[PDB]
Design a protein around this ligand. Structure first.
Ligand SMILES: [Mg+2]
Ligand SMILES: [Mg+2]
Ligand SMILES: [Mg+2]
Ligand SMILES: [Mg+2]
Ligand SMILES: [Mg+2]
Ligand SMILES: [Mg+2]
Ligand SMILES: [Mg+2]
Ligand SMILES: [Mg+2]
Ligand SMILES: [Mg+2]
Ligand SMILES: [Mg+2]
Ligand SMILES: [Mg+2]
Ligand SMILES: [Mg+2]
Ligand SMILES: [Mg+2]
Lengths: 141, 92, 136, 131, 38
RNA sequence: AGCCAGGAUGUUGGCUUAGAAGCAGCCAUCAUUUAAAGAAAGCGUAAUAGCUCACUGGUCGAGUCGGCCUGCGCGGAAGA
């Protein structure tokens, strides 16, 4: 495994193929072309889901293309369809926005265990629960 | 919550100010059928004592001439602007 | 700008601002701005010092104004000789002795209170200090 | 830093772990990453739970005050950074090698992986363990 | 520099120094914060 | 206070789909792995990246950051 050469995690909704206003210059900053994030980008995206943001490693080399392994979609984008309210966050402590229980978030927690770091399921359970704590969703334990 | 204190002999305007200009201040102990007792005591202790909330509630044992008198701080006179005490009324 | 709503008498003697203050303890709020110095506060200074507090702590918190003017200060116009009547009432002032709590504050942190009272203190002529509500 | 009692609790906690332990392993991030944090420690989670206290405090008299009572050879290990990675389940577990294996996996250096105490040995990469 | 009568520590890197009787405020980050007197 | 060190994988997190990505504004202010890490005090970005500081480690190793109460001083302080 090599050290920091030129890898950066950056791209909007994975369904949005070839983003120029959202990202544009950043993914085409290095020697890698703009076309690479379109054909090869939607190869792995179409398996899981579209209209969903998902990250990937961009370890650029002097050859032409780059090696990559995709990870997992982040916490609250998943807590849209799962949570209910589109507006995640607003004025929680002064005015509670929403609420989620342990049973849903504990079940949602373990599905990312390929990417997630922890000891037990109950360990990352209160983490990926906690991801709700911070959207004005004081966890219904 | 135990303070050594002397008995006053001079008392009035002249004495009290002379006293307060010597790191001390006049207080008084009274209550029950016994007579009131005027009590000179040190400033810098009692200033630090009053920071705690227990001071204005709990029982204090003031040591006078050997004898330990049990009291509660009923009333108190702050100095107008400077952070310092002028006088304390100890109820028995 | 604070002012009495009707009075018995329009014009008042100059008087002598002496002795110590009476509004000494912090009664309503948790914190307060006590007047160390002696002097007088105009209606304008009070409003100016209120605005400087109110804007610092934002919408949150609660503020009292323990002082109120109720003393009309006359002033003679420019290019006018002495006598021929008492002057006309220009502004309204509260006499401030040492010890007087000016402003009181509640529902804020101690850290953010002190900085709010500094901004007010900078608008006032009198030397002031911070005081906390002590229980008895 | 809190009272002599609070400080005493920390070492007296560490000494009790040596009583119910066996193998240990050094680790000195002298240019690691937190991306590494949860590999060498994430391992310990994959073992079972929180109990595996790596207690990084080998200071000349801090964990070396507990030395006189438990394992006197670790006094010489003091100089330069060391972590006393005290284990619990499994006599001579796989937690020793993984510090040396993680060192290659994006951690710059790892104390020159000198090791601690099972046969009272020095700097030796040892795959020969119970598995 | 500024020669105001109330010099003070504006940012974090500002530092108060007394040179030849005068109180100055020297700064590493912003030379704007360089100010003397007071 | 100094010195080679660490100071996260999902957080492109929902949000007004133009972005707010630890840090415009919203508020929450996770919990894991654990020596430690706030989902962040500051710098830097169209936003990222990145660099610092909180904290935690190991070295050298002893007294030290801060607030009132005050005694004297210092600046503020330019005219024929
Ligand atoms: Mg008399
Ligand atoms: Mg009499
Ligand atoms: Mg007299
Ligand atoms: Mg009675
Ligand atoms: Mg009179
Ligand atoms: Mg009166
Ligand atoms: Mg009255
Ligand atoms: Mg004329
Ligand atoms: Mg010179
Ligand atoms: Mg001179
Ligand atoms: Mg001048
Ligand atoms: Mg000149
Ligand atoms: Mg002349």
């Amino acid at each position: 495994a090599k050290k920091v050469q030129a890898y950066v995690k950056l791209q909007v909704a994975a369904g949005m193929a070839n983003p120029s206003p959202p990202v544009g210059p950043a993914l085409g900053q290095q020697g890698v072309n703009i076309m690479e994030f379109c054909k090869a980008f939607n190869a792995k995206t179409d398996s899981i889901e579209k209209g969903l943001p998902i990250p990937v490693v961009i370890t650029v080399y002097a050859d032409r293309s780059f090696t990559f392994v995709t990870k997992t979609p982040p916490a609250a984008v998943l807590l849209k369809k799962a949570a209910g309210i589109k507006s995640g966050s607003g004025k929680p402590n002064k005015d509670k926005v929403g609420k989620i229980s342990r049973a849903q978030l504990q079940e949602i927690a373990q599905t990312k265990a390929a990417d997630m770091t922890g000891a037990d399921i109950e360990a990352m359970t209160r983490s990926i629960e906690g991801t709700a704590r911070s959207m004005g969703l004081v966890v219904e334990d | 919550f135990t303070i050594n204190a002397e008995v006053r002999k001079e008392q009035g305007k002249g004495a009290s100010r002379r006293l307060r200009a010597a790191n001390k201040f006049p207080a008084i102990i009274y209550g029950g059928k016994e007579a009131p007792l005027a009590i000179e005591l040190d400033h810098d202790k009692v200033m630090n004592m009053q920071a705690k909330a227990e001071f204005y509630s709990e029982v204090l044992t003031i040591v006078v001439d050997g004898k330990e008198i049990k009291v509660k701080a009923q009333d108190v006179q702050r100095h107008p602007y400077k952070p310092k005490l002028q006088h304390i009324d100890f109820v028995r | 700008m604070l002012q009495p709503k009707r009075t018995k008498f329009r014009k008042m003697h100059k008087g002598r601002n002496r002795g110590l203050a009476q509004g000494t303890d912090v009664s309503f709020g948790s914190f307060g701005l006590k007047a160390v110095g002696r002097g007088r506060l105009t209606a304008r200074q009070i409003e100016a010092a209120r605005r400087a507090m109110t804007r610092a702590v934002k919408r949150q918190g609660k503020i009292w104004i323990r002082v109120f003017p109720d003393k009309p200060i006359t002033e003679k116009p420019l290019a006018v000789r002495m006598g021929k009547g008492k002057g006309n009432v220009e502004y309204w002032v509260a006499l401030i002795q040492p010890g007087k709590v000016l402003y009181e504050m509640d529902g804020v942190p101690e850290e953010l209170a002190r900085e709010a009272f500094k901004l007010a203190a900078a608008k006032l002529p009198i030397k002031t200090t911070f005081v906390t509500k002590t229980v008895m | 830093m809190a009272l002599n009692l609070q400080d005493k609790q920390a070492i007296v906690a560490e000494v009790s772990e040596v009583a119910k332990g066996a193998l240990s392993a050094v680790v000195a991030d002298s240019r690691g990453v937190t991306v590494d944090k949860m590999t060498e420690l994430r391992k310990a989670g994959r073992e079972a739970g929180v109990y595996m206290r790596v207690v990084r405090n080998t200071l000349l008299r801090r964990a070396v005050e507990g030395t006189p009572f438990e394992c006197l050879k670790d006094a010489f290990v003091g100089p330069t950074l060391i972590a006393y990675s005290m284990e619990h389940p499994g006599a001579a577990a796989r937690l020793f090698k993984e510090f040396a294996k993680a060192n290659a996996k994006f951690e710059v250096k790892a104390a020159a992986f000198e090791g601690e105490l099972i046969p009272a040995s020095q700097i030796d990469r040892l795959a020969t363990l119970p598995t | 520099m500024k020669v105001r009568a109330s010099v003070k520590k504006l940012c974090r890197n500002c530092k108060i120094v007394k040179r030849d009787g005068v109180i100055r405020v020297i700064c590493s980050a912003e030379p704007k914060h360089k100010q003397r007197q007071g």
